[PDB]
Each structure stands twice: as C-alpha cells, then as structure tokens.
Design a protein around this ligand. Sequence first.
Ligand SMILES: *[C@@](O)(C(=O)N[C@H](CC)c1ccccc1)[C@H](C)NC(=O)[C@H](CC(=O)N(C)C)NC(=O)[C@@H](NC(=O)[C@@H](NC(=O)CCCCCN)C(C)(C)C)C(C)(C)C
Ligand SMILES: *[C@@](O)(C(=O)N[C@H](CC)c1ccccc1)[C@H](C)NC(=O)[C@H](CC(=O)N(C)C)NC(=O)[C@@H](NC(=O)[C@@H](NC(=O)CCCCCN)C(C)(C)C)C(C)(C)C
Lengths: 230, 230
Amino acid sequence: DEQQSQAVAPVYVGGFLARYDQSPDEAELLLPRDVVEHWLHAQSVALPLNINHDDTAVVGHVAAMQSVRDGLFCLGCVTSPRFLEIVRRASEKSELVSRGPVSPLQPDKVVEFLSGSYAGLSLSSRRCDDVEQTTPFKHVALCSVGRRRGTLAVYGRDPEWVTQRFPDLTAADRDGLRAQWQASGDPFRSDSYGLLGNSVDALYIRERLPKLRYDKQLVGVTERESYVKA
Amino acid sequence: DEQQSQAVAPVYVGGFLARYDQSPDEAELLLPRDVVEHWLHAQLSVALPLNINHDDTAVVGHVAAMQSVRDGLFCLGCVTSPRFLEIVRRASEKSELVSRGPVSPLQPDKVVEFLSGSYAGLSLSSRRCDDVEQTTPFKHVALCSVGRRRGTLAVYGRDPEWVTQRFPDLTAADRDGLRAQWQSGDPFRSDSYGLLGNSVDALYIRERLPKLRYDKQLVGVTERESYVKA
Ligand SMILES: *[C@@](O)(C(=O)N[C@H](CC)c1ccccc1)[C@H](C)NC(=O)[C@H](CC(=O)N(C)C)NC(=O)[C@@H](NC(=O)[C@@H](NC(=O)CCCCCN)C(C)(C)C)C(C)(C)C
Ligand SMILES: *[C@@](O)(C(=O)N[C@H](CC)c1ccccc1)[C@H](C)NC(=O)[C@H](CC(=O)N(C)C)NC(=O)[C@@H](NC(=O)[C@@H](NC(=O)CCCCCN)C(C)(C)C)C(C)(C)C
C-alpha cells in the first residue's frame, strides 16, 4: 500500500523536441534555432503534456523549455494520478517491465512502463514554412516514437537525474532548466481502453525501434544508464 | 445500442500454426507433418483454449478445428468471451488505425479490425518435440502480435467460411475437413490493464512488422482482401 504510493508519485520526463543538427525527412518538420529562440522569448502558462497528441489524454505539463546547442530540450512532469494509476496497473502485467532495469538502477515499474510505451517526444507547434515568424508552442506529447529524430524521452523520479542522462547538456543548460521547473484537478479525461486503443496504432509505425535506437545513439543516452528500453 | 451488439458478436480466427515448408530459426520450433498428423490423431476431444499471448488468465475463446493440410497445420478458432470483446469494442473506438477503416470493399468492423491489428499472429503451445518419444501434445493456441513460426499470420472475420476463404492454399477438401470440426462461463480472467500491459511487450519484438508482411506474403493473404493491417 506504501509501495503503491511510491509507484504513483510524480514522474519526470526530459529530452529534445528537436535536434538542430538533424534535417527532417519532411519540410513541415523544419524547426531551426533562430525560430525556436524567437518563439521561446515570444510566448507564462505551462504547455500541457499529453499522450500521442490527444487533448483528452493530458497527463501533466511541461515545466521547462530551453534552447541548447544541439537543439530544443524540454523537461516535463507526469502528474495525473489517474494516468499513473493506470500505468501502475498495466506495468504489473508487462513481461518487459518484470525483467527490470539495467546494471545498478532500482526497478521502477511505472517509470519503466512509460519508458517502453512512450520512448519519444513530439512537439505541437505552429506551421513554420518560412513566412511570418500568438503562442507557437501548443503542447508536448509522449509517444511511441517521434517524427523528429533525437526526440527520445527519458523518464525518472528526479528532474536533475533526468537532465543528467544527456551528455550534450552543460551545467549552464541544466541551470537554465532548473530555473524554470522550480490544471485545477486531474487533466486526464481518458482511460485504459483509450491507451490500449492507442497501442495498436503504435504497432504500425514504420521502423519504430530502429528510429528509437538511432535517437538513443544520437542523444548519447546509450552511454549513460537509464530506464530506456529501446 | 444494437450496433454495439453486432460489434461484440463472436469473432472467428484462422491461420496456420506452422508451415511445413518453413525451417524454423530455432530447433525447438521444429514441428513436422509426420509428428503433427500423429499428434492430431493422438488427441479432437476437449477443445484447446484460445488465449492472449499465452496467458492462462487471458483465455478469450477456444480452438474449434485443427487440420493438417499440404502446406502446414491450419487451425480455426473463435473469440467468444464477452469481457474480452467488450474491452476490444472500447479500445477499437480509440484507434486511429481502426478509424481509417478496412480496404476496398470490406465493411468497417472496429472489433475485428482491432484484433486484426493487435494480434496479427498465432502461436501454438505444444510439447517439446526434440525428436524422441514422439496424453495431449497440443496445449493451446495464442493470439499474439507476431508469431515465432513464420506463416502464422492470424485472419479474423465474422464468418468461419469467409475466414478459411482468405487462404488460397486451402482446398475444398481442406475447408471441408475444417467445417466438419467447427460444428460454462466467460473464460477471460483479465482486463484492459493486462492487455495494455501486454502491449508494451509487443512494442519490443524485433522485426515485428517485416515478419508479418513476410507471413502475409507466404500465406497468400496479400492477394485476397481481408482485415489484416500488416
Ligand atoms: C510528433 O513527433 C508526433 O506526432 N509523433 C507521432 C506519435 C505517434 C508519430 C507520427 C508518425 C510516425 C511516428 C510517430 C510530431 C513531431 N508532431 C506532429 O506531427 C504534430 C502533431 C500535432 O500537433 N497534432 C496532431 C495536433 N504536428 C505539428 O506540430 C504540425 N502543426 C500543425 O499542424 C499546426 N497547424 C497550424 O499551424 C495551421 C495549419 C493547419 C494544421 C492542421 N489543421 C497545429 C496548430 C494544428 C498543431 C506541424 C508543425 C508539423 C506542421
Ligand atoms: C508463439 O508464436 C509465441 O510465443 N509468440 C510470441 C508472441 C509475442 C513471441 C515471442 C517472442 C518473439 C516473437 C513472438 C510460439 C510459436 N510459441 C511458443 O514459443 C510456445 C509458448 C508456450 O507454449 N507458452 C508460453 C506456454 N512454446 C512452446 O510451445 C514450447 N513448448 C513447451 O515449452 C512445453 N514444454 C514441454 O513440452 C516440456 C519441456 C521440458 C519438460 C521436462 N519435464 C510446454 C508444455 C510448456 C508448452 C516449444 C514447443 C517451443 C518447445
């Protein structure tokens, strides 16, 4: 009963929403540093964090967005108790979760589950297309894999520890983030049936795993140890 | 609420549990025709149960017929659990893949389409062969994201004949031997959280999609039209 309270405690997520050094496979995915930094400075209210862009599946909020040297990095927090309770339960029934985490990390079913199902981040921003460079950043979505390479999502119970998984990040970067991450109920208006529904869609994404490994390698989270399952 | 009764009606599943013309990647998967036909004749008294990814608490129906044809062992089963179907009914409403609907002239069928996407394969549960003292060798059949034996693609439909009709290899004499065979409570002791749990595991099977397409091509279901999503 206490173990179940530790499992449903807030969980943090971090990762790049876009890698400046990565030319997208599609023109509409182009999101350059000049634009990002402008948009950041442009738009207060936190961007909501949801599951695969579903407005009824908001599970938390983005706590910090920072533009670093290699891209736009963000740090958010899964806070919805309904989503976490669901995850808590689904995790108990995952052969993958049961096999546990790597080398010296302690098992963490909830975190491990999110680490497996939503290994990527996917931004929701206004169409760039190079014109009239309002709130451009709509929200951030946890997903099976992102359209932009390098968007691998890293989950952990501590924000510092999450940011620490990324070698590219400097102290000044981890500092700009720490400054930021330091509503009115449960934002989650969905359920297990929905997540399950969304799971089959994930099964049909092309080259899902290969992309994730690529993302894992590009962001250097391969080196450090974490709950990533890709 | 009549549409919801048509959606939760029994669903049939068919496909090969093993292709004799396919040498397994692992020795323990070897299941030759001589053995099969012997085992068949050996045991079909009590029906083999049909479950999700080999989970004893996830029995969703039973196998109605097992026949050894020229290219392999083919089976036809029926998903009958109302609990499993109600779960599927609901999850289907939340699948972008299901919403896109079926091919060319097939009518949309959320439940069938959902099962078609999540459990595209069949996986037998039999006694270790290993070539020795070759009683009930056939334990059960499991619906899964993809099978270990190639050609084990699963085809779902509301009509048994129509299901068997999806396989070109099958002859009339074959469809006849099957039709002869497929003529107290809800065996499902699991839930959405469990299926959801099992979904993350699926996400990490290697070459899942490529295998399915292979299976789809090997069994010639590529030619005919069906609810297959692979
Ligand atoms: C993100 O990684 C993602 O969606 N990944 C998914 C996860 C399953 C995925 C898809 C395929 C293969 C693997 C994974 C990805 C980077 N983000 C988007 O694609 C994102 C989705 C989104 O915001 N929604 C579905 C709402 N799309 C966008 O950010 C786009 N923005 C818009 O469409 C915006 N529209 C406009 O500015 C006006 C033009 C008309 C748009 C359509 N009505 C807006 C405000 C609607 C979001 C793009 C920036 C990519 C154009
Ligand atoms: C099936 O396709 C499958 O499991 N697919 C899954 C779906 C995701 C998959 C997993 C990884 C990668 C891709 C797909 C596959 C063909 N079936 C099996 O592997 C099957 C599973 C199973 O039966 N259970 C989980 C219960 N395994 C077998 O059929 C094996 N049989 C046994 O292990 C049997 N054991 C014995 O006969 C005795 C062993 C020694 C006893 C000494 N006293 C039994 C009764 C436990 C089933 C094999 C046929 C492979 C031997």
